[PDB]
Amino acid sequence: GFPTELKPGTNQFLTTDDGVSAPILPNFHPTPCIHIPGEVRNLLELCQVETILEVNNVPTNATSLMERLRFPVSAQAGKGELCAVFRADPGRSGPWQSTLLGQLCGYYTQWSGSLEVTFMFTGSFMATGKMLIAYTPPGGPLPKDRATAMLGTHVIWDFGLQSSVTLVIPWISNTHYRAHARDGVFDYYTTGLVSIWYQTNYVVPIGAPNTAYIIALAAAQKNFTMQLCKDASDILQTGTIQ
């Protein structure tokens, strides 16, 4: 027969190897594929779809879980009080873990590109207000006050006919890619911190609520890519199914 040598690697079963194997059904033909609306071709198509960013984190008491989807914003009787703040890291815990981008990122070790976080104001039409929203790139601590917060990438948001402003947090990294930043030595790949300040005030007329809520939606920009396939950070099983 034809002379062959077996190189190391034979009889091994690599779970990700793309080889061929014997077919069970000779001349079987799959039932014709009719048209089905909204076909997915690349996971990046889903990563550009905005989903709720759970910036409010309170498990209390597993009944008020729906509060996790929104900001409390109220008529501060001061100047430039801090509203909210969270990490820009998508694969890190935990606000991004409510987003579809966050979970899809959980299936990939490396990502790259700008991200978008859109904030929708859900107060009354009579309610107005201007607020600063700052993105502070890696390095630097939590901005203690608004004056030393604006020094980074920020956007001034005016409440009006258009509910939502979108803070684009541009791809600012030393590396071409960022591995998940969690949570010690791997802070090297952190994206930074997003903080929300009151630019002026939440101002209300006589017959309208003194407190309103803000909803944050998050997704990836179009220069977004993912590179390395890992298992989901959390496995959902304890202990045997059925």
Partner: protein, 297 residues
């Protein structure tokens, strides 16, 4: 006139699905054009209305002065084929010498991809999926030892005679596929075509498979689409005298030529049953980790 006008013009029977959007090639990540300052009235990208139901169209070039970036990051890793061509655990078949479980060296397993969360959740991201498959069968003892045994895996499609014995007459396999492997041999591997009567498998069937009244009896058949119930899987010893070794068979599924369709939110609760999205009601967990205050990290 002749014929009536409301039939002539009428768009009844229009076949082609009117496409609101076409697909463009994206081999690399999108490049970034240079940007400058802009102080104008009327041109306002940042302001948007989420109520509409669309994602932010605001590009980074109009939110910050940007440089030029020739992005050549590939998007190949993020495709349905290169995301699902990963062999995962989908079944564990036990053949103990004597126990509560199957004690005669013949086990039957109605083919259910679920029952193993990791492979399940990844797949449950989409509602409809159409794909060919590559099955791998790993056989060993409960200690992982390799022993000189001869197994017979047999694929039993819906309606075919199921084995009721270790030495059943159904093991003649005159038509339905079966594989004869030794445990000495490397894992058996088989390619499998898409064989649903529908254009795609469904991970979700929002309905009942039968007609009539749906009382509390036939209420467990809710969510049962037989289109992705592809039959049962059977193993032999082989006969005729009982085996000498305890055996374990693990089934691994690799997907190729994948085509998913409509996207689905991603499970955040512990899976509890096969083909059934039940969950522990008093132990409802948040989708992610939580912190002490919204003003702290």
């Amino acid at each position: 006139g002749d014929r009536v006008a409301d039939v002539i013009e009428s768009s009844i029977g229009d076949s082609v699905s009117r496409a609101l959007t076409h697909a463009l090639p994206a081999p690399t990540g999108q490049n970034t054009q240079v940007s400058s300052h802009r102080l104008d009235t009327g041109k306002v990208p940042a302001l948007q209305a989420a109520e509409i139901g669309a994602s932010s169209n605001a590009s980074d070039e109009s939110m910050i002065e940007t440089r030029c970036v020739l992005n050549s990051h590939s998007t190949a890793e993020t495709t349905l084929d290169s995301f699902f061509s990963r062999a995962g655990l989908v079944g564990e078949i036990d053949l103990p010498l004597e126990g509560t479980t199957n004690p005669n060296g013949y086990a039957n397993w109605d083919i259910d991809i679920t029952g193993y969360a990791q492979m399940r959740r990844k797949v449950e991201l989409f509602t409809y999926m159409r794909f060919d498959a590559e099955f791998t069968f790993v056989a060993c003892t409960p200690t992982g030892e390799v022993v000189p045994q001869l197994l017979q895996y047999m694929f039993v499609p819906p309606g075919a005679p199921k084995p009721d014995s270790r030495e059943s007459l159904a093991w003649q396999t005159a038509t339905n596929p079966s594989v004869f492997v030794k445990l000495s041999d490397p894992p058996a591997q088989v390619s499998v075509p898409f064989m649903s009567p529908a254009s795609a498998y469904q991970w979700f069937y929002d309905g009942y498979p039968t007609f009539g009244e749906h009382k509390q009896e036939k209420d467990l058949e809710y969510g049962a689409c037989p289109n992705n119930m592809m039959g049962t899987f059977s193993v032999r010893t082989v006969g005729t005298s009982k085996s000498k070794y305890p055996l374990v068979v693990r089934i691994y599924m690799r997907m190729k030529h994948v085509r998913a369709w409509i996207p689905r939110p991603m499970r955040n609760q512990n899976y509890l049953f096969k083909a059934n999205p039940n969950y522990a009601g008093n132990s409802i967990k948040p989708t992610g980790a939580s912190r002490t205050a919204i003003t702290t990290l």
